[PDB]
Amino acid sequence: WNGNFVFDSPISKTLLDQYATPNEFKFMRYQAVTCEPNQLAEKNFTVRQLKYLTPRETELMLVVTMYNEDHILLGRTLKGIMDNVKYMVKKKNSSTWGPDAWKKIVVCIISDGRSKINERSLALLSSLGCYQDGFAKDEINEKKVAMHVYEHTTMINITNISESEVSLECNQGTVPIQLLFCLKEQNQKKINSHRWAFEGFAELLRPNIVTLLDAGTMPGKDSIYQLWREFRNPNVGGACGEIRTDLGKRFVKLLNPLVASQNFEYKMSNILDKTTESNFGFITVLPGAFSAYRFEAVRGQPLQKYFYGEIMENEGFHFFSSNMYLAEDRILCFEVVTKKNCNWILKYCRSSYASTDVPERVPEFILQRRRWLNGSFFASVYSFCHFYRVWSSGHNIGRKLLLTVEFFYLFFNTLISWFSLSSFFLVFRILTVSIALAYHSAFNVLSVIFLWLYGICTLSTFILSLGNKPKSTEKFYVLTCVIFAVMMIYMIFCSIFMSVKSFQNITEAFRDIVISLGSTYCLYLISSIIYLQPWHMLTSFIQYILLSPSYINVLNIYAFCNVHDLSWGPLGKINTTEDGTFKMEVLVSSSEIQANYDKYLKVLNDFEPSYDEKKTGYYANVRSLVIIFWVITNFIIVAVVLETGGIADYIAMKSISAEIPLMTSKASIYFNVILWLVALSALIRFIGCSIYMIVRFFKK
Amino acid sequence: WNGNFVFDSPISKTLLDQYATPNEFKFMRYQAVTCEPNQLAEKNFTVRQLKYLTPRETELMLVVTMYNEDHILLGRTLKGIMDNVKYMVKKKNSSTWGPDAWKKIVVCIISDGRSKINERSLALLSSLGCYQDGFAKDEINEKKVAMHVYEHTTMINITNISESEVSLECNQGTVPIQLLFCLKEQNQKKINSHRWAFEGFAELLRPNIVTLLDAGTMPGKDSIYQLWREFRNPNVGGACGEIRTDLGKRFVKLLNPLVASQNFEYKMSNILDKTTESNFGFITVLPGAFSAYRFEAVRGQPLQKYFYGEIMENEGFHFFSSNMYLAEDRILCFEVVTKKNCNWILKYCRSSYASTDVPERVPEFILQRRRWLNGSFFASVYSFCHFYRVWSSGHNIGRKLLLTVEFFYLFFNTLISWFSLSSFFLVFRILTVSIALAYHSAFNVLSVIFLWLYGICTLSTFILSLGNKPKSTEKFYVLTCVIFAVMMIYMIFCSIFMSVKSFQNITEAFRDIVISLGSTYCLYLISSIIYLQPWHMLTSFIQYILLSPSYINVLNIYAFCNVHDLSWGPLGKINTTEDGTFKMEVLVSSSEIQANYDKYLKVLNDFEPSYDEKKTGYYANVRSLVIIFWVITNFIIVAVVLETGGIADYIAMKSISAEIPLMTSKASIYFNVILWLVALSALIRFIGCSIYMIVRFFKK
Numbered sequence A, B: 001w002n003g004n005f006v007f008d009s010p011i012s013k014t015l016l017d018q019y020a021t022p023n024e025f026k027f028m029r030y031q032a033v034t035c036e037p038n039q040l041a042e043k044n045f046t047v048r049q050l051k052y053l054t055p056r057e058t059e060l061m062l063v064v065t066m067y068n069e070d071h072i073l074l075g076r077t078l079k080g081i082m083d084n085v086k087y088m089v090k091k092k093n094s095s096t097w098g099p100d101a102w103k104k105i106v107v108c109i110i111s112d113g114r115s116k117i118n119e120r121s122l123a124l125l126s127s128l129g130c131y132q133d134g135f136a137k138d139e140i141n142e143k144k145v146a147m148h149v150y151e152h153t154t155m156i157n158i159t160n161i162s163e164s165e166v167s168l169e170c171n172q173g174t175v176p177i178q179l180l181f182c183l184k185e186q187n188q189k190k191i192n193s194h195r196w197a198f199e200g201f202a203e204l205l206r207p208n209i210v211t212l213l214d215a216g217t218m219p220g221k222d223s224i225y226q227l228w229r230e231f232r233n234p235n236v237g238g239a240c241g242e243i244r245t246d247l248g249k250r251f252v253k254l255l256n257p258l259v260a261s262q263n264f265e266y267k268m269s270n271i272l273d274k275t276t277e278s279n280f281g282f283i284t285v286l287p288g289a290f291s292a293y294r295f296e297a298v299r300g301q302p303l304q305k306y307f308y309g310e311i312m313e314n315e316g317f318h319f320f321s322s323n324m325y326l327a328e329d330r331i332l333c334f335e336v337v338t339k340k341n342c343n344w345i346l347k348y349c350r351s352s353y354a355s356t357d358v359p360e361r362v363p364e365f366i367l368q369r370r371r372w373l374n375g376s377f378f379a380s381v382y383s384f385c386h387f388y389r390v391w392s393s394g395h396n397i398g399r400k401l402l403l404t405v406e407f408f409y410l411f412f413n414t415l416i417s418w419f420s421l422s423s424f425f426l427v428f429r430i431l432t433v434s435i436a437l438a439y440h441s442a443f444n445v446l447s448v449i450f451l452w453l454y455g456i457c458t459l460s461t462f463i464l465s466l467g468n469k470p471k472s473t474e475k476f477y478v479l480t481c482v483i484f485a486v487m488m489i490y491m492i493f494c495s496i497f498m499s500v501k502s503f504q505n506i507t508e509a510f511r512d513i514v515i516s517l518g519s520t521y522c523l524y525l526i527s528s529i530i531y532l533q534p535w536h537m538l539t540s541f542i543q544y545i546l547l548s549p550s551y552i553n554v555l556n557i558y559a560f561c562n563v564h565d566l567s568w569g570p571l572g573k574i575n576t577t578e579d580g581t582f583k584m585e586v587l588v589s590s591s592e593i594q595a596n597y598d599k600y601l602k603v604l605n606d607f608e609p610s611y612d613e614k615k616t617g618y619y620a621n622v623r624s625l626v627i628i629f630w631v632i633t634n635f636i637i638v639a640v641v642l643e644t645g646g647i648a649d650y651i652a653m654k655s656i657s658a659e660i661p662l663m664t665s666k667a668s669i670y671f672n673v674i675l676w677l678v679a680l681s682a683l684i685r686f687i688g689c690s691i692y693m694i695v696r697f698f699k700k
Ligand SMILES: CC(=O)N[C@H]1[C@@H](OP(=O)(O)OP(=O)(O)OC[C@H]2O[C@@H](n3ccc(=O)[nH]c3=O)[C@H](O)[C@@H]2O)O[C@H](CO)[C@@H](O)[C@@H]1O
Pocket: A065, A066, A067, A068, A069, A112, A188, A189, A190, A214, A215, A287, A358, A359, A364, A365, A367, A368, A371
């Protein structure tokens, strides 16, 4: 048909039996896509939405990218989607959604790898009627087929998902859903799945909004509709929602101390950072979040530089052009906001949420955060370096000024996060030596012991992150996290104990610690109260404080030590039937003997590797230059403050031209500066959250 | 023939033409070896030496192992061998060698990899008549052939090797040579080549002595005979010779400062360490050296534990059993010396030498020394741990005592080499702070600058050795070596300057530096004079002193950071002739549709990796535990001596229960202890060399 392989094989008699309990419900269509994603329209490839008597104008296209997820995660995502669609078809007073909105929504499941996909998921997919085995082809007319497209409109919905089963039923209350199962055949990464979603089927369907989901992310009963409502404002070019950690049956997972930490971290992030950024107009949407992008807004330059990167490039490598892939989705946001002659803004929707599952062991936690930290660091660097693009866009003067201010503040936060390695050690060492030097009881030996414990855990973390893999050594990482938590406890004890003794004595530089610690805690709590989600402030808060030194001295170290994933990397056969082989006049020729010799004589008379190894060498050099600069700059700060690195020796020698004192006023000055910075950051984020809630309330 | 593939195809008419200028000169025999090395005799595989009317009893078997060497290196080795054979056939007053000794010597060339071999070498090999293309088979009777054996007795010899050609002639003065070209087909390592040499063809030939050569190692005009003469003493179970760096045409390569360093290092090693060990009776033969092993001595337990390792082992891993492969050839020596009920000794022959080619760039130099350092470290650890085996052997009481003493002294040297990382820094820092503290002029800033330069070059060396590869970053390694050489120059200047000023003033702890530095230099020079090879003592000596800090702070770091090489790591096709394909009743069946669905339904109802990854994880853990212990122990020494690591702070706090002084007497005590150790080592090696020369002279 039209030069492409197609097939319409009716679904199983069983499925068709319940579906009946029109043509598109009754056949399942297959399509062998053998072209590039950016050639779907010109190759005469189409989708059923475009074949009926009246073509279907789609309003919302939902992309689910699955790699090897079990049927539970995918079933969770699909159940969320079907619940949303049922809500949107039961809506009464609405111009867009209605009893036939099931026709304006398309679900696109871009599976990755025919080898990698879990059959557990294909069981669910075929049970829904969007897939069946037998007619998947491996190459068509000397061309390898790039992916397989199965299209069905199933009338069944998942209504219950226990810990082991998914309940599929077909009643008068179920709604049809337009599935579209894409299935790549070889393991190309997530960016290629997005390339198929955006440059491929979105070019044929022409949706209004394009929503990106993952496998295992459950949207709420009402989340997708609330995210769709954000695009009423014609200036909105993107949006995102809140991300909740799901705690399992009656919050059983809170007993794990690595899940409570992430619960508090997620809810703090959503309450403070997302609202503060959304006030200005530019967001940097969280990885696990589900986002939506107006097709017109992302169409053109944003997509082009998200997929291919900076085109202007010679045969050699350039820094931003060849590393931008580390900040994958955060380039779409930056290019949408700063589009030329266009005033798109990014908005954060709090009425839309989705509950995802978080890692529960340290190895996978570290491996997950390795991508987040690198992405956030490179995205901030790039966005700060290219802030002049804000003044070439179409925004008004006030919105350009606001975006410039936000880009400066984001780089300020990145600069703070870069020096955390030295900041934590400086605070810890100054505090432990100050209390020892003031009270003398047993804190001298504790100071020495804790200095040595940190150094044995920092050195080992560097070495294992540079050479080993987290899965190989999990017990050591658990031990390191426990040791850092104990050090945190000791730091808290020192601060409280000296503050209490100074209160009894009344010093300023230590009673100030009480002043700030209370201010930032109260700002956190007041923001939580205003956001109307305050239970995290006590339920899962302590574990965040204890596993916070391990987020600054383990996740950061592994993230920086693993910037890029560097993977370095006949004739003749005899089978005699029975003591007898094949004879001939070949070789017997003597002239050939003088001819299979003269050639060899001449070869004793006559007297850079591929692009992959070159790119790998460049990536390794970049990774080892970043690490070295990080360590050197942090030690520069430490040696300037504590007078380590032989500086105190040098000053003593100049004075002789004496001996080293125990502590100086630089320690006090630095100790005040750090808490001032922390207080300023907390104040800024509190003000941002307050403005967000006030504006939202007035608009509502 | 006998169930194995054979072929006797006369050599090229050209070759045969000059050979004539008997049967074995005229045919070249091929053999497809499809068994294991330890099965050659039982498989009814033989070699021509065993087929004549009178079987040939071989006296000397020479093994040359080549991997991808050009025809120049292999031609060099072959020319050395043919010169030796000519010398041994022209000998007059000898019971063994004579006009027919060409019959008692077999050359075995165990090439590795049909894919890896350089055709440049096959040109030379076929030009000699020991190889010709066309009848090499890839598998025989459903069995893959393991290697190809070509056997010829060529009458041509190489008589001149210019920089670009090898001169092959056939006169009345040439001698026949019994070549035997082994050619493995897949890249198995050198230990498997030795397994073929020892468990394979040596089992058929039954030689008296087995000599191991490499491609590119040129034995002298008389070296092999002088090595053979060492086995007259029935107690000798092995032997080795001197290794000379060849300097090229009129010593042009001495202009390179990385070749002069290795020249001096090699000649010092041969003069001191080999003679000192050979006095006791156990040697640990240098890597590039060519060695000989009596077959009876190595036959049995030594070979068995060289090839397979410790047999007693459960499913899990053990340290020595699973890492002994790092000390490859040094296990043969240890097992020969300590053989049960046998009194074999290892002797060092100085009358036999061989000139090899040394690396001239820093990346390949580091990569070469990475194997030497790991091998020497593990071999010393194993030999010290198993010294009790010396008292279970057959030696007399005095020789057991001598071997025990030697094993203790070797581990003492290893223990010294383990702490060199801290020793160098301690000496450097104490010296630079002492001169600054005494003279004040400009040495304060130099002390700070040099402390920072060392730390920026040590940190970078750790990071690049752990993450990167030497070939990727050569400029930085050159820069680091230059910086370390400048630091060495500054240390020498400080020592000389303070010693001169103390001489003018007359302190003891610095004029002592002059006392030792002169004693060790004079012992070096006197040993060189006695060994009668004194030109290295001035020609290539300075470059060894300047590139010595880079042998302690670059080769060691890379060797320890790279202990083991950790490499982590369908149906359907359509080709329509013309808009028409293959149709059938397959799939059309509806029952199958309900059958390709019920299976999937059930798969949604039903509700450690391989040995390689486990071994890789174990190896990585071992590598990262060794590194951590090395760094921790060296810093323990440094912090105890210099009172770093917060110890001085702790002592000051106890005294308050004051402030840190600049330097203590621990620095003086350590500084004296180090030079005392150096003087003791130099004295021991000088005495060993003197005893060696005196004994050899008296015996001669
Ligand atoms: C290197 C690594 O171990 N990554 C970890 C991390 O990354 P992280 O969670 O960032 O990444 P995910 O693998 O979860 O990727 C998110 C989306 O990508 C799809 N998709 C598609 C193609 C592809 O190559 N990769 C891919 O992930 C995924 O199923 C999902 O749809 O998350 C999890 C920890 O809880 C673990 O699964 C992993 O240990």
